[PDB]
Every structure is written in C-alpha cells, then in structure tokens.
Amino acid sequence: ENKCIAVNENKVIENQKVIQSLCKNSHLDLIEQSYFGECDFIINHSTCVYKIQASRFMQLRNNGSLHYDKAVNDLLTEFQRVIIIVEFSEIIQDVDPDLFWKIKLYLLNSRVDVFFIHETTDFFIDWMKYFIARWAFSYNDEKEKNIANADILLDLGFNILLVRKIFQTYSLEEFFMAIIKEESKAVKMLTVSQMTRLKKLLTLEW
Amino acid sequence: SEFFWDVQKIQEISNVEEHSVVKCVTVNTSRLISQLNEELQDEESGVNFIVTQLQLLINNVYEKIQKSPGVPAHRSLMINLNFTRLKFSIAYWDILLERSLDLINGPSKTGARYFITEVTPVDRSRYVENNQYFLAFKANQRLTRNSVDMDEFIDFEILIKQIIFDLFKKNGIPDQDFEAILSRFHNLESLVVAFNE
C-alpha cells in the first residue's frame, strides 16, 4: 500500500528541495507528469496543490486580468479541490496586512483552500506531508487490463491519478455505463467540466 | 479551561461569492496574547494551548451564528476570524487553525469553513463590490467551469472510432454488420448501452 502523488514536470527544479525531502518516505511514489495545469503537485484524483507568490498577486497581465487569474480558473476546471499555497515575505504582515484578507476573499470558494506560508522550504514540505497524509491514496486495484483504454481517458485530459482511481472500480465500459446511468460513485469522481467533456464524447452522433 | 477570546461582533461581508455566505467575526486577542507571553514558558506547551483556544472559538462562533437569524441554507458558510492582533505570523495561524479543525468532529467542522486575518481600518464589503478585477475573476471563473475548450483536446472522433472498433471486435460483430448497427445506434451512449444491457 504505497501512496502515490504526481509532480508537474515543469516545476520539478523549483521544487527539487521539497521533492528530495518527501522522497525520504519509503512509502511514497512521486510520479512526474505532464498535465494541463500550473499546479505543482496532484495529491489525488481531484486534488492539486498550486504555489503562488503573494507579491505577484496584483500584477496585471497584458489581457487585463491579474497574474494568477487564468491559472486558478483553469485548475477549477479539473480539480474538485484546488489548494493554493501563497508564499509571502513576513514583512507583509507589518507593512501591508490588508493583502492577507484581500487574497483570501478574492480566491474565496468552497473548492479552494488558501494557506499562507513563509518563503522557506520547511513550510512547503510540512504542508505537503500534511496533504499527503490527509488526501493521498494508493491505487493497487486494476479492473482495466487494456492500456489503450487508459489512453482514451488520458486523451480526454484526465490526470493519471483520476485514471487510476477510475480503473480501480470500473473497466472503461463499466465507467461509461455508470456515467450514462448517473450512478453517483462515477459522477462524483469528476468535475462539472469533466462530466460535460465526457457526455460530449458519449453523445456525439455519427 | 477558560475562554481567552473576546468575540466583539459578527457582520456579513455581503458580496463575496454567490454560492457562499461570508461572516466576519471581530475577535479581541489581547487577553489570549497576555496568557502566552506572561504564563507560557515553551512553544510546545503554548501550541497546545492555542489549539485548545481555537477549538473553543470555532465552537463558540459557529454556535452563535446558528442561533442568529441568518440562513446559510444551500450556500456554503465561510467564517472569517478577524483578530484585533495576530502577534505571531499569519502563517502559523493558518497551520494552527487547520490542525485544530482536524481534531473536531462536531457540526462546527463539517458545517463551515474558517480563515484568520488581522483587523484593519479598510472596509472590506466596499472593497469586494468596488474591485473590478475581482468581479472579472468570478465571471471568468464561471464561464470556464461551464465551457469546454474543444481545441485543447484531440478530435473526439478519433476516440469514438477507437471505442467502436473495440465494441464490435469484443461482441463478435463482423464488418458486413457495422453499417446496420451504426444506423440503429447513433452515438456511444446508445451503442454502449445496447452492448451491456
């Protein structure tokens, strides 16, 4: 029963000190993944962790949005739980204490957890171990034996743990059938957006 | 063993997020703070005191809000614990608040979300309704949740053809029968059901 999480291929070097510490746990597999999203880590089939800087939160993009606007909204498409880790310099608490509540109200959402951390590695490592212990899983079971069927879920954009989580309970056909019958166990694996992507696939007429 | 918070007043921040109710609770922490420095020698011993105090506050504040004529109803309840003084770093408060919530099993944990901030003179309900970037962020949030960018994915037809040939192969369906069957069932939904029921 080895718990498994995924790290974003683009953020490995930034997180290399975090990863070095986490991988001391002989009961954790860290899978490097290429996936839609700016999140640093994927804790389970529908939980990601995304580290942002408080100091950049109010910088404007060329298209008129704030720095992290589209990244956060994109993650909310794929993850039922989006955990936002906000690094800030302690000086902010004395020089600009309004930023804390502004950020938390701006991001306020039942599917978004926001935690402020200092810029040190220890803080992020400790939150990560907390997230692993609370939300990560092993994926020992496998009711789908055909790797091409996993490619199908991967091409729909499902991250690899959502695929493993699905293939724990269903073969691909059973999953299709359970979504077509709106059985709650299958439906609650997905976001609204993943649910609509899938129904499009099952509903497109030749 | 005792309640060191002074909960001053509960107000709503009216226009944060359409599917949630946001309560702002002003907590005077002067009494709590003087317990720490005056009568706590070690950080470890003081951590457990703060955790206990935090569970008392959470329970007290949740309970007060449930007796008050405010109907959370379907909407998510988020409770903002607004401290007159933080003394230590917000980052330790976020840790301690989460750890305290992790121990609670009663309704105050499952019925609400919490976050801590420091009191300031700025009016937050005015800020939420004046800030355009905030408004733009929520509109874009709902547009992206309810839309599928089909360009970011590969052609659905490639996947559908794959499944079709698999079903037919799986169910003993010769090529000379493909046509009749695809003319009976017009999408994967119909086709898959016809093969498993």
Curated annotation (Swiss-Prot), chain A:
It comes from the Eukaryota. GO terms for biological process: homologous chromosome pairing at meiosis; homologous recombination; positive regulation of protein sumoylation; protein sumoylation; reciprocal meiotic recombination; regulation of synaptonemal complex assembly; synaptonemal complex assembly. Keywords: Cell cycle, Chromosomal rearrangement, Chromosome, Chromosome partition, DNA-binding, Meiosis, Nucleotide-binding, Nucleus. Its main location: nucleus. It is found in: Nucleus; Chromosome. Belongs to the ZIP2 family. Interacts with ZIP3. Required for initiation of meiotic chromosome synapsis. Involved in synaptonemal complex formation, a structure that tethers a pair of homologous chromosomes along their lengths and plays a central role in recombination and homolog segregation during meiosis. Required for the normal localization of MSH4 to chromosomes. This is Protein ZIP2. It comes from Saccharomyces cerevisiae (strain ATCC 204508 / S288c) (Baker's yeast). The lineage of its organism: Eukaryota, Fungi, Dikarya, Ascomycota, Saccharomycotina. The gene is ZIP2. The chain holds residues 499 to 704 of 704 of the full protein.
UniProtKB/Swiss-Prot annotation, chain B:
It comes from the Eukaryota. GO terms for biological process: ascospore formation; homologous chromosome pairing at meiosis; homologous recombination; positive regulation of protein sumoylation; protein sumoylation; reciprocal meiotic recombination; regulation of reciprocal meiotic recombination; regulation of synaptonemal complex assembly. The keyword Cell membrane does not apply. InterPro entries: Spo16_C, Spo16_N. One of its GO terms (cellular component) is nuclear chromosome. Pfam families: Spo16_C (PF21698), Spo16_N (PF19225). GO terms for molecular function: DNA secondary structure binding. Keywords: Meiosis, Sporulation. Necessary for efficient spore formation. This is Sporulation-specific protein 16. It comes from Saccharomyces cerevisiae (strain ATCC 204508 / S288c). The lineage of its organism: Eukaryota, Fungi, Dikarya, Ascomycota, Saccharomycotina.
